[PDB]
């Protein structure tokens, strides 16, 4: 690549490694914040809109219950998530502002992105046009170029994890499965529709799984549904490993060609994992109209700007039962989470 890209990535890695080696810890506490509204909820945590009581700034606070993290075998994953997030810096990654823990929970306080998840917008519109999908895809390509150069695999690409910001650009969130990996890794994780064949088949896999997932995402953005759908995961997995994909007739020939090379079941032949690396993707005809530098610099006008009233507006997120943030009087799982 141009020396300009090499030097950019060398500096990116220098800065990442310094923070990776000496992570920040314990940079706020719960009673610095007011709770506003639950924005999302899962099996071991939830994300809440909060407001800092002294500055008035809004943030999204991810709260993980230490005991449930342990029960669901997510200890290392949660430690990965925080250690990576506090060390990365890129225009399309949600910024971690504070982290801390208490007797019961782990907390990651992030910039609040009021536009909501791409998932909502995609389902509301139906599908994105190719230019619209391409604008988002280009951001993911650059983000993966960045992450992979740091030896990071993301492992959870899907529309729910892509927030739309006030300029209409992507912020990737949820580093719960992200990991620093030189070579291969083995954990079964991800969402079924987005899993590469080599994950399903229990292989030692690498960053090529992220490029497969990009193929799934581009297909889903442009079609409105993912390429390997079914009612049971096992039936999804059979389709994924089959080597067959059908494309809507409205897809351009260039889109189909790119997707055949991303959704390549032989990981040794998959775009993003060949000798030319990311440049096989960036130079593909489907991306011929993309000005990569202008995307990075946020100079391209976005396909749309989410509608929201201000930094406290939660309209683009949905409604969940509001549950307590209870902190035990006794420390739980202290040893397991020492480094957090």
Ligand X SMILES: NC(=O)c1ccc(O)cc1
Of 76-84, 107-115, 187-195, 241-249, the segment contacting ligand X by CB under 6 A is 107-115
Active-site residue, selected from the candidate residues 65, 156, 210, 280: 156
Q: Which long-range contacts (CB under 8 A, 24 or more apart) does 119-127 make?
A: 119/158, 119/159, 119/160, 119/162, 120/316, 120/318, 121/164, 121/304, 121/306, 122/159, 122/220, 122/221, 122/224, 126/224, 127/221, 127/222, 127/223, 127/224
Among positions 49-68, residues that touch ligand X (CB under 6 A) are 60
For 215, phi then psi, to 5°, come to: -55, -45
Least Å from the CB of residue 163 to ligand X: 6
Query: Taking CB under 6 A as the criterion, which residues in 277-316 touch ligand X?
Result: none
The region of 39-47, 118-126, 206-214, 268-276 touching ligand X under the rule CB under 6 A is 39-47
Cβ 162 to ligand X shortest distance, Å = 10
Question: Applying CB under 6 A, does 40 fall inside the site for ligand X?
Answer: yes
Compute the distance between CA of residue 101 and CA of residue 4 in angstroms, rounded to an integer.
40
Cβ(70)–Cβ(32) under 8 Å?
no
Rule CB under 6 A: say whether 209 interacts with ligand X.
no
Stretch that binds ligand X, among 7-15, 23-31, 104-112, 127-135 (CB under 6 A): 104-112
In the complex with ligand X, the residue whose CB is nearer, 112 or 237, is: 112
Regarding 112 and contact with ligand X (CB under 6 A), the answer is yes
Catalytic residue check, 156: yes
Among 185, 239, 237, residue whose Cα is nearest residue 207: 185
272 contacts 144 by C-beta, under 8 angstroms: yes
Under the binding rule (CB under 6 A), the answer on residue 216 touching ligand X is no
Task: Determine, following the binding rule CB under 6 A, whether residue 162 of this chain makes contact with ligand X.
Answer: no
Neighbouring CB atoms inside 10 A of 289's CB total 10
12, 20, 33, 39: residue in contact with ligand X (rule CB under 6 A): 39
Tell me which of 12, 79, 108, 110 binds ligand X, using CB under 6 A: 110
Interface segment toward ligand X; rule CB under 6 A; list 108-116, 138-146, 193-201, 285-293 = 108-116
With b meaning 16 or more CB within 10 Å and e meaning fewer, what string describes 305-314? Answer: ebebeebebb
Query: Is the dihedral angle over the CA atoms 50, 175, 337, 95 positive or is it negative?
Result: negative
Considering only residues 164-203, where is the footprint of ligand X by CB under 6 A? Answer: 173
Instruction: For residue 111, say whether it is annotated as part of any ligand binding site.
Output: yes
Residues 31, 17: Cα–Cα separation, whole Å = 32
Annotated binding site for ATP: 39-47, 62, 111-117, 158-161
């Amino acid at each position: 690549e141009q020396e300009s890209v090499k030097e950019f990535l060398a500096k990116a890695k220098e800065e990442f490694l310094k923070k990776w080696e000496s992570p920040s810890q314990n940079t706020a506490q719960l009673d610095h914040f007011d709770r506003i509204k639950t924005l999302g909820t899962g099996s071991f945590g939830r994300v809440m809109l909060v407001k800092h009581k002294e500055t008035g700034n809004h943030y999204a606070m991810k709260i993980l219950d230490k005991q449930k993290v342990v029960k669901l075998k997510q200890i290392e994953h949660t430690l990965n998530e925080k250690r990576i997030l506090q060390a990365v810096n890129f225009p399309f990654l949600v910024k971690l502002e504070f982290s801390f823990k208490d007797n019961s929970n782990l907390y990651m306080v992030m910039e609040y992105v009021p536009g909501g998840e791409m998932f909502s917008h995609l389902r509301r519109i139906g599908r994105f046009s190719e230019p619209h999908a391409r604008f988002y895809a280009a951001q993911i390509v650059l983000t993966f170029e960045y992450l992979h150069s740091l030896d990071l695999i993301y492992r959870d690409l899907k529309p729910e994890n892509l927030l739309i910001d006030q300029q209409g650009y992507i912020q990737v969130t949820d580093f719960g499965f992200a990991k620093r990996v030189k070579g291969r890794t083995w954990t079964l994780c991800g969402t079924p529709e987005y899993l590469a064949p080599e994950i399903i088949l229990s292989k030692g896999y690498n960053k090529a799984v992220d490029w497969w997932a990009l193929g799934v995402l581009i297909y889903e953005m442009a079609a409105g549904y993912p390429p390997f759908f079914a009612d049971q995961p096992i039936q999804i997995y059979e389709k994924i490993v089959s080597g067959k994909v059908r494309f809507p007739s409205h897809f351009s020939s260039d889109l189909k060609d790119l997707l055949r090379n991303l959704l390549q079941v032989d990981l040794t032949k998959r775009f993003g994992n060949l000798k030319n690396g990311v440049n096989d993707i960036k130079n593909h005809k489907w991306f011929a109209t993309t000005d990569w530098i202008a995307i990075y610099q946020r100079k391209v006008e976005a396909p749309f700007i989410p509608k929201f009233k201000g930094p406290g507006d939660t309209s683009n997120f949905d409604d969940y039962e509001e549950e307590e943030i209870r902190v035990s009087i006794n420390e739980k799982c202290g040893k397991e989470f020492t480094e957090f």
